[PDB]
mmCIF file of N, CA and C in Angstrom:
data_model
loop_
_atom_site.group_PDB
_atom_site.id
_atom_site.type_symbol
_atom_site.label_atom_id
_atom_site.label_comp_id
_atom_site.label_asym_id
_atom_site.label_seq_id
_atom_site.Cartn_x
_atom_site.Cartn_y
_atom_site.Cartn_z
ATOM 1 N N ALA A 1 36.375 48.538 18.670
ATOM 2 C CA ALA A 1 36.280 48.001 17.247
ATOM 3 C C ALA A 1 35.569 46.748 17.085
ATOM 4 N N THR A 2 35.902 45.846 18.095
ATOM 5 C CA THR A 2 35.179 44.467 18.172
ATOM 6 C C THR A 2 33.880 44.585 18.611
ATOM 7 N N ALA A 3 33.506 45.151 19.512
ATOM 8 C CA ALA A 3 32.216 45.409 19.820
ATOM 9 C C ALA A 3 31.272 45.913 18.748
ATOM 10 N N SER A 4 31.943 47.043 18.026
ATOM 11 C CA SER A 4 31.222 47.469 17.036
ATOM 12 C C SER A 4 31.076 46.563 16.014
ATOM 13 N N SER A 5 32.164 45.684 15.672
ATOM 14 C CA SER A 5 32.206 44.798 14.508
ATOM 15 C C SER A 5 30.909 43.792 14.717
ATOM 16 N N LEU A 6 30.683 43.231 16.026
ATOM 17 C CA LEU A 6 29.772 42.218 16.229
ATOM 18 C C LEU A 6 28.415 42.608 15.709
ATOM 19 N N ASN A 7 27.933 43.679 15.237
ATOM 20 C CA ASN A 7 26.594 43.881 14.893
ATOM 21 C C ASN A 7 26.220 43.122 13.763
ATOM 22 N N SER A 8 27.176 43.252 12.711
ATOM 23 C CA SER A 8 27.125 42.397 11.600
ATOM 24 C C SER A 8 26.737 40.782 11.565
ATOM 25 N N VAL A 9 27.574 40.397 12.513
ATOM 26 C CA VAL A 9 27.353 39.073 13.245
ATOM 27 C C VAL A 9 26.088 38.769 13.721
ATOM 28 N N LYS A 10 25.273 39.777 14.439
ATOM 29 C CA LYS A 10 24.030 39.636 14.839
ATOM 30 C C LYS A 10 23.056 39.725 13.584
ATOM 31 N N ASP A 11 23.156 40.660 12.717
ATOM 32 C CA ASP A 11 22.312 40.831 11.619
ATOM 33 C C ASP A 11 22.395 39.529 10.613
ATOM 34 N N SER A 12 23.536 38.921 10.652
ATOM 35 C CA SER A 12 23.713 37.705 9.730
ATOM 36 C C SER A 12 22.773 36.466 10.570
ATOM 37 N N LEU A 13 23.108 36.287 11.998
ATOM 38 C CA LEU A 13 22.414 35.261 12.419
ATOM 39 C C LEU A 13 20.883 35.287 12.332
ATOM 40 N N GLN A 14 20.495 36.614 12.511
ATOM 41 C CA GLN A 14 18.806 36.694 12.392
ATOM 42 C C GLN A 14 18.496 36.561 10.912
ATOM 43 N N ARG A 15 19.310 36.893 9.842
ATOM 44 C CA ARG A 15 19.041 36.753 8.328
ATOM 45 C C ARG A 15 18.896 35.368 8.292
ATOM 46 N N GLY A 16 19.719 34.541 8.787
ATOM 47 C CA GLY A 16 19.791 33.144 8.881
ATOM 48 C C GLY A 16 18.312 32.522 9.395
ATOM 49 N N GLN A 17 18.118 33.104 10.675
ATOM 50 C CA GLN A 17 16.713 32.728 11.102
ATOM 51 C C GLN A 17 15.319 32.949 10.164
ATOM 52 N N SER A 18 15.686 34.283 9.453
ATOM 53 C CA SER A 18 14.580 34.651 8.498
ATOM 54 C C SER A 18 14.512 33.564 7.319
ATOM 55 N N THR A 19 15.692 33.070 6.995
ATOM 56 C CA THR A 19 15.733 32.098 5.756
ATOM 57 C C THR A 19 15.207 30.855 6.039
ATOM 58 N N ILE A 20 15.492 30.366 7.278
ATOM 59 C CA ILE A 20 15.031 29.207 7.928
ATOM 60 C C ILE A 20 13.644 29.206 8.142
ATOM 61 N N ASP A 21 13.015 30.430 8.403
ATOM 62 C CA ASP A 21 11.607 30.512 8.754
ATOM 63 C C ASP A 21 10.902 30.429 7.493
ATOM 64 N N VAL A 22 11.549 30.750 6.320
ATOM 65 C CA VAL A 22 10.801 30.798 4.954
ATOM 66 C C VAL A 22 10.860 29.258 4.535
ATOM 67 N N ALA A 23 11.893 28.520 4.768
ATOM 68 C CA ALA A 23 12.172 27.111 4.511
ATOM 69 C C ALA A 23 11.092 26.119 5.199
ATOM 70 N N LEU A 24 10.908 26.536 6.436
ATOM 71 C CA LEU A 24 9.752 25.810 7.216
ATOM 72 C C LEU A 24 8.551 26.309 7.000
ATOM 73 N N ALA A 25 8.180 27.404 6.367
ATOM 74 C CA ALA A 25 6.921 27.765 5.844
ATOM 75 C C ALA A 25 6.620 27.080 4.509
ATOM 76 N N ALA A 26 7.563 26.846 3.808
ATOM 77 C CA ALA A 26 7.363 26.006 2.512
ATOM 78 C C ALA A 26 7.152 24.365 2.883
ATOM 79 N N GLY A 27 8.039 23.897 3.961
ATOM 80 C CA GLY A 27 7.906 22.455 4.301
ATOM 81 C C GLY A 27 6.663 22.251 4.978
ATOM 82 N N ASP A 28 5.990 23.118 5.684
ATOM 83 C CA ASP A 28 4.685 22.907 6.253
ATOM 84 C C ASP A 28 3.735 22.636 5.047
ATOM 85 N N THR A 29 3.892 23.139 3.712
ATOM 86 C CA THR A 29 2.929 22.878 2.635
ATOM 87 C C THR A 29 3.364 21.554 2.136
ATOM 88 N N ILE A 30 4.700 21.259 2.025
ATOM 89 C CA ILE A 30 5.151 20.159 1.258
ATOM 90 C C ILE A 30 4.890 18.887 2.364
ATOM 91 N N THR A 31 4.856 19.151 3.599
ATOM 92 C CA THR A 31 4.278 17.848 4.301
ATOM 93 C C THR A 31 2.869 17.594 4.143
ATOM 94 N N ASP A 32 1.966 18.482 4.088
ATOM 95 C CA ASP A 32 0.669 18.053 3.806
ATOM 96 C C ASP A 32 0.441 17.538 2.367
ATOM 97 N N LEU A 33 1.202 18.058 1.437
ATOM 98 C CA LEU A 33 1.092 17.646 0.005
ATOM 99 C C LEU A 33 1.467 16.245 -0.023
ATOM 100 N N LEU A 34 2.569 15.776 0.726
ATOM 101 C CA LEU A 34 2.866 14.364 0.826
ATOM 102 C C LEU A 34 1.874 13.575 1.586
ATOM 103 N N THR A 35 1.332 14.315 2.677
ATOM 104 C CA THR A 35 0.183 13.393 3.319
ATOM 105 C C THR A 35 -1.071 13.145 2.333
ATOM 106 N N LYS A 36 -1.290 14.056 1.465
ATOM 107 C CA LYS A 36 -2.398 13.626 0.465
ATOM 108 C C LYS A 36 -1.919 12.895 -0.575
ATOM 109 N N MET A 37 -0.451 12.946 -0.829
ATOM 110 C CA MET A 37 -0.142 11.782 -1.838
ATOM 111 C C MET A 37 -0.183 10.425 -1.235
ATOM 112 N N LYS A 38 0.043 10.126 -0.180
ATOM 113 C CA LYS A 38 -0.056 8.738 0.468
ATOM 114 C C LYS A 38 -1.421 8.553 0.636
ATOM 115 N N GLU A 39 -2.244 9.393 0.844
ATOM 116 C CA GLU A 39 -3.781 9.146 0.996
ATOM 117 C C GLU A 39 -4.365 8.726 -0.270
ATOM 118 N N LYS A 40 -4.053 9.431 -1.434
ATOM 119 C CA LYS A 40 -4.445 8.988 -2.684
ATOM 120 C C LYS A 40 -3.998 7.918 -3.387
ATOM 121 N N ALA A 41 -2.525 7.457 -2.804
ATOM 122 C CA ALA A 41 -1.769 6.289 -3.322
ATOM 123 C C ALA A 41 -2.672 5.068 -2.521
ATOM 124 N N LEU A 42 -2.940 5.184 -1.154
ATOM 125 C CA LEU A 42 -3.788 4.215 -0.764
ATOM 126 C C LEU A 42 -5.038 4.040 -1.274
ATOM 127 N N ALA A 43 -5.843 5.010 -1.783
ATOM 128 C CA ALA A 43 -7.031 5.070 -2.432
ATOM 129 C C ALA A 43 -6.814 4.168 -3.768
ATOM 130 N N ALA A 44 -5.864 4.518 -4.407
ATOM 131 C CA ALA A 44 -5.557 4.036 -5.913
ATOM 132 C C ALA A 44 -4.973 2.469 -5.664
ATOM 133 N N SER A 45 -4.452 2.007 -4.562
ATOM 134 C CA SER A 45 -4.130 0.691 -4.476
ATOM 135 C C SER A 45 -5.133 -0.253 -4.766
ATOM 136 N N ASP A 46 -6.408 0.123 -4.513
ATOM 137 C CA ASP A 46 -7.557 -0.868 -4.553
ATOM 138 C C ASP A 46 -7.710 -1.415 -5.926
ATOM 139 N N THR A 47 -7.932 -2.837 -5.993
ATOM 140 C CA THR A 47 -8.231 -3.383 -7.188
ATOM 141 C C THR A 47 -9.700 -3.299 -7.653
ATOM 142 N N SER A 48 -10.373 -3.087 -6.613
ATOM 143 C CA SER A 48 -12.071 -2.876 -6.570
ATOM 144 C C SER A 48 -12.443 -1.433 -7.404
ATOM 145 N N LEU A 49 -11.775 -0.504 -7.520
ATOM 146 C CA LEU A 49 -12.161 0.519 -8.096
ATOM 147 C C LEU A 49 -12.243 0.255 -9.906
ATOM 148 N N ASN A 50 -13.402 0.906 -10.466
ATOM 149 C CA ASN A 50 -13.591 0.930 -11.785
ATOM 150 C C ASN A 50 -12.440 1.959 -12.336
ATOM 151 N N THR A 51 -12.082 1.707 -13.474
ATOM 152 C CA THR A 51 -10.978 2.319 -14.152
ATOM 153 C C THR A 51 -11.033 3.802 -14.080
ATOM 154 N N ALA A 52 -12.254 4.479 -14.247
ATOM 155 C CA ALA A 52 -12.573 5.923 -14.287
ATOM 156 C C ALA A 52 -12.009 6.581 -12.858
ATOM 157 N N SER A 53 -12.581 5.787 -11.874
ATOM 158 C CA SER A 53 -12.129 6.540 -10.535
ATOM 159 C C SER A 53 -10.418 6.290 -10.324
ATOM 160 N N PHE A 54 -9.940 5.258 -10.838
ATOM 161 C CA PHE A 54 -8.607 5.123 -10.716
ATOM 162 C C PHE A 54 -7.760 6.248 -11.513
ATOM 163 N N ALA B 1 0.067 11.738 9.974
ATOM 164 C CA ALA B 1 0.184 11.345 8.736
ATOM 165 C C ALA B 1 -0.663 9.940 8.634
ATOM 166 N N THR B 2 0.139 9.042 9.708
ATOM 167 C CA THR B 2 -0.717 7.582 9.736
ATOM 168 C C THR B 2 -1.962 7.649 10.165
ATOM 169 N N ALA B 3 -2.498 8.766 10.870
ATOM 170 C CA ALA B 3 -3.815 8.925 11.196
ATOM 171 C C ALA B 3 -4.817 9.295 10.152
ATOM 172 N N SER B 4 -4.436 10.392 9.366
ATOM 173 C CA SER B 4 -5.420 10.880 8.262
ATOM 174 C C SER B 4 -5.311 10.018 7.238
ATOM 175 N N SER B 5 -4.290 9.002 6.973
ATOM 176 C CA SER B 5 -4.345 8.007 6.072
ATOM 177 C C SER B 5 -5.307 7.117 6.135
ATOM 178 N N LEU B 6 -5.927 6.942 7.178
ATOM 179 C CA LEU B 6 -6.786 5.686 7.551
ATOM 180 C C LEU B 6 -8.184 5.929 6.982
ATOM 181 N N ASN B 7 -8.522 7.211 6.441
ATOM 182 C CA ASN B 7 -9.797 7.594 5.928
ATOM 183 C C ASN B 7 -9.845 6.627 4.557
ATOM 184 N N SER B 8 -8.865 6.461 3.730
ATOM 185 C CA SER B 8 -8.896 5.802 2.525
ATOM 186 C C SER B 8 -9.150 4.463 2.972
ATOM 187 N N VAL B 9 -8.712 3.750 3.947
ATOM 188 C CA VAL B 9 -8.982 2.311 4.359
ATOM 189 C C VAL B 9 -10.619 2.190 4.794
ATOM 190 N N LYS B 10 -10.937 3.081 5.486
ATOM 191 C CA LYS B 10 -12.409 3.280 5.841
ATOM 192 C C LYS B 10 -13.283 2.978 4.332
ATOM 193 N N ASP B 11 -12.907 4.015 3.674
ATOM 194 C CA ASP B 11 -13.637 4.073 2.464
ATOM 195 C C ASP B 11 -13.602 2.850 1.499
ATOM 196 N N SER B 12 -12.356 2.047 1.610
ATOM 197 C CA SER B 12 -12.139 1.030 0.933
ATOM 198 C C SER B 12 -12.905 -0.154 1.555
ATOM 199 N N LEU B 13 -13.020 -0.347 3.059
ATOM 200 C CA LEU B 13 -13.655 -1.467 3.494
ATOM 201 C C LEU B 13 -15.231 -1.143 3.281
ATOM 202 N N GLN B 14 -15.708 0.187 3.249
ATOM 203 C CA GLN B 14 -17.131 0.423 3.063
ATOM 204 C C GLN B 14 -17.448 -0.161 1.648
ATOM 205 N N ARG B 15 -16.521 0.169 0.685
ATOM 206 C CA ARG B 15 -16.862 0.142 -0.755
ATOM 207 C C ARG B 15 -17.109 -1.494 -0.887
ATOM 208 N N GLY B 16 -16.128 -2.272 -0.315
ATOM 209 C CA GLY B 16 -16.256 -3.717 -0.252
ATOM 210 C C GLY B 16 -17.376 -4.235 0.379
ATOM 211 N N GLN B 17 -17.951 -3.905 1.481
ATOM 212 C CA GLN B 17 -19.136 -4.146 2.237
ATOM 213 C C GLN B 17 -20.171 -3.854 1.132
ATOM 214 N N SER B 18 -20.192 -2.744 0.620
ATOM 215 C CA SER B 18 -21.273 -2.203 -0.426
ATOM 216 C C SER B 18 -21.345 -3.467 -1.662
ATOM 217 N N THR B 19 -20.260 -3.818 -2.111
ATOM 218 C CA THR B 19 -20.266 -4.650 -3.131
ATOM 219 C C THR B 19 -20.710 -6.254 -2.650
ATOM 220 N N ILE B 20 -20.359 -6.583 -1.445
ATOM 221 C CA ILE B 20 -20.841 -7.782 -0.943
ATOM 222 C C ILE B 20 -22.140 -7.817 -0.915
ATOM 223 N N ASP B 21 -22.763 -6.553 -0.300
ATOM 224 C CA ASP B 21 -24.366 -6.339 -0.387
ATOM 225 C C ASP B 21 -24.948 -6.494 -1.513
ATOM 226 N N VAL B 22 -24.376 -6.056 -2.658
ATOM 227 C CA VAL B 22 -25.022 -6.177 -3.872
ATOM 228 C C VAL B 22 -24.889 -7.770 -4.412
ATOM 229 N N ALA B 23 -23.738 -8.379 -3.907
ATOM 230 C CA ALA B 23 -23.736 -9.661 -4.356
ATOM 231 C C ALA B 23 -24.770 -10.676 -3.634
ATOM 232 N N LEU B 24 -24.912 -10.246 -2.348
ATOM 233 C CA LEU B 24 -25.912 -11.089 -1.540
ATOM 234 C C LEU B 24 -27.208 -10.710 -2.048
ATOM 235 N N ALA B 25 -27.553 -9.438 -2.606
ATOM 236 C CA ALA B 25 -28.870 -9.238 -3.187
ATOM 237 C C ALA B 25 -29.102 -10.047 -4.387
ATOM 238 N N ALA B 26 -28.119 -10.319 -5.228
ATOM 239 C CA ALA B 26 -28.177 -10.979 -6.562
ATOM 240 C C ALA B 26 -28.402 -12.432 -6.011
ATOM 241 N N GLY B 27 -27.762 -12.849 -4.925
ATOM 242 C CA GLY B 27 -28.074 -14.324 -4.605
ATOM 243 C C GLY B 27 -29.115 -14.645 -3.809
ATOM 244 N N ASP B 28 -29.778 -13.821 -3.404
ATOM 245 C CA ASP B 28 -31.291 -13.870 -2.826
ATOM 246 C C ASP B 28 -32.056 -14.414 -3.999
ATOM 247 N N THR B 29 -32.000 -13.716 -5.100
ATOM 248 C CA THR B 29 -32.720 -14.085 -6.352
ATOM 249 C C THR B 29 -32.153 -15.466 -6.681
ATOM 250 N N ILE B 30 -30.938 -15.722 -6.739
ATOM 251 C CA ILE B 30 -30.268 -16.807 -7.447
ATOM 252 C C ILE B 30 -30.868 -18.171 -6.606
ATOM 253 N N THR B 31 -30.825 -17.935 -5.346
ATOM 254 C CA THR B 31 -31.337 -19.082 -4.687
ATOM 255 C C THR B 31 -32.736 -19.449 -4.898
ATOM 256 N N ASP B 32 -33.854 -18.494 -4.774
ATOM 257 C CA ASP B 32 -35.085 -18.839 -5.080
ATOM 258 C C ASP B 32 -35.213 -19.687 -6.549
ATOM 259 N N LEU B 33 -34.427 -18.967 -7.529
ATOM 260 C CA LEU B 33 -34.394 -19.658 -8.932
ATOM 261 C C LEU B 33 -34.015 -21.055 -8.752
ATOM 262 N N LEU B 34 -32.853 -21.295 -7.993
ATOM 263 C CA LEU B 34 -32.485 -22.856 -7.835
ATOM 264 C C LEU B 34 -33.603 -23.678 -7.320
ATOM 265 N N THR B 35 -34.455 -22.902 -6.208
ATOM 266 C CA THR B 35 -35.573 -23.697 -5.627
ATOM 267 C C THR B 35 -36.823 -24.126 -6.711
ATOM 268 N N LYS B 36 -37.040 -22.966 -7.364
ATOM 269 C CA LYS B 36 -38.136 -23.265 -8.242
ATOM 270 C C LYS B 36 -37.525 -24.366 -9.552
ATOM 271 N N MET B 37 -36.351 -24.396 -9.729
ATOM 272 C CA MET B 37 -35.608 -25.297 -10.661
ATOM 273 C C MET B 37 -35.914 -26.517 -10.025
ATOM 274 N N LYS B 38 -35.425 -26.910 -8.909
ATOM 275 C CA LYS B 38 -35.406 -28.335 -8.271
ATOM 276 C C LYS B 38 -37.184 -28.713 -8.281
ATOM 277 N N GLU B 39 -38.075 -27.914 -7.899
ATOM 278 C CA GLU B 39 -39.355 -28.073 -7.961
ATOM 279 C C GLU B 39 -39.784 -28.665 -9.342
ATOM 280 N N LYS B 40 -39.477 -27.570 -10.242
ATOM 281 C CA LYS B 40 -39.693 -28.288 -11.533
ATOM 282 C C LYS B 40 -39.145 -29.455 -12.200
ATOM 283 N N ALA B 41 -37.800 -29.783 -11.685
ATOM 284 C CA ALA B 41 -37.324 -30.942 -12.162
ATOM 285 C C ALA B 41 -37.912 -32.111 -11.308
ATOM 286 N N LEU B 42 -38.315 -31.906 -10.152
ATOM 287 C CA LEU B 42 -39.126 -33.167 -9.378
ATOM 288 C C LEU B 42 -40.464 -33.314 -9.810
ATOM 289 N N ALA B 43 -40.894 -32.325 -10.505
ATOM 290 C CA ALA B 43 -42.338 -32.516 -11.241
ATOM 291 C C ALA B 43 -42.145 -33.053 -12.532
ATOM 292 N N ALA B 44 -41.003 -32.850 -13.193
ATOM 293 C CA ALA B 44 -40.737 -33.642 -14.328
ATOM 294 C C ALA B 44 -40.414 -34.964 -14.371
ATOM 295 N N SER B 45 -39.705 -35.316 -13.236
ATOM 296 C CA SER B 45 -39.283 -36.743 -13.197
ATOM 297 C C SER B 45 -40.270 -37.735 -13.286
ATOM 298 N N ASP B 46 -41.750 -37.420 -12.741
ATOM 299 C CA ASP B 46 -42.699 -38.485 -12.890
ATOM 300 C C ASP B 46 -43.108 -38.779 -14.372
ATOM 301 N N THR B 47 -43.451 -40.027 -14.589
ATOM 302 C CA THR B 47 -43.716 -40.314 -15.789
ATOM 303 C C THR B 47 -45.153 -40.343 -16.208
ATOM 304 N N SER B 48 -46.197 -40.095 -15.235
ATOM 305 C CA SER B 48 -47.476 -40.123 -15.518
ATOM 306 C C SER B 48 -47.964 -39.036 -16.474
ATOM 307 N N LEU B 49 -47.146 -37.937 -16.569
ATOM 308 C CA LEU B 49 -47.588 -36.890 -17.102
ATOM 309 C C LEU B 49 -47.522 -37.016 -18.907
ATOM 310 N N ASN B 50 -48.415 -36.628 -19.430
ATOM 311 C CA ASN B 50 -48.467 -36.418 -20.901
ATOM 312 C C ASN B 50 -47.452 -35.773 -21.515
ATOM 313 N N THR B 51 -47.135 -35.813 -22.744
ATOM 314 C CA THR B 51 -46.156 -35.308 -23.419
ATOM 315 C C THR B 51 -46.145 -33.667 -23.408
ATOM 316 N N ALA B 52 -47.318 -33.207 -23.386
ATOM 317 C CA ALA B 52 -47.666 -31.907 -23.227
ATOM 318 C C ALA B 52 -47.059 -31.091 -22.036
ATOM 319 N N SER B 53 -47.564 -31.764 -20.865
ATOM 320 C CA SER B 53 -47.276 -31.328 -19.562
ATOM 321 C C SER B 53 -45.685 -31.319 -19.428
ATOM 322 N N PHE B 54 -45.031 -32.486 -19.876
ATOM 323 C CA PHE B 54 -43.579 -32.636 -19.695
ATOM 324 C C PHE B 54 -42.850 -31.400 -20.629
#
């Protein structure tokens, strides 16, 4: 009964792996988005820009 | 992230170099104008000229 019962534990562990996979797949986008954020913030830090570019 | 962020620094230094280039292009005119100014003043300093030349 215990050895048969372990199968749901296995399925839960790999369902959790799938959920963490989806989370990391979104974080790969969030990181690039923050990188473009910091790049545009560096570009907007300049006082030399005319107002339209800012 | 720190590597990709430097493109904005490159664009900023390049924009500043272009602005200093435009300022020097104006100064090349400004200095020749000051030189012709000093020549006209040295010509006007002399008393021998009649009123029309002054």
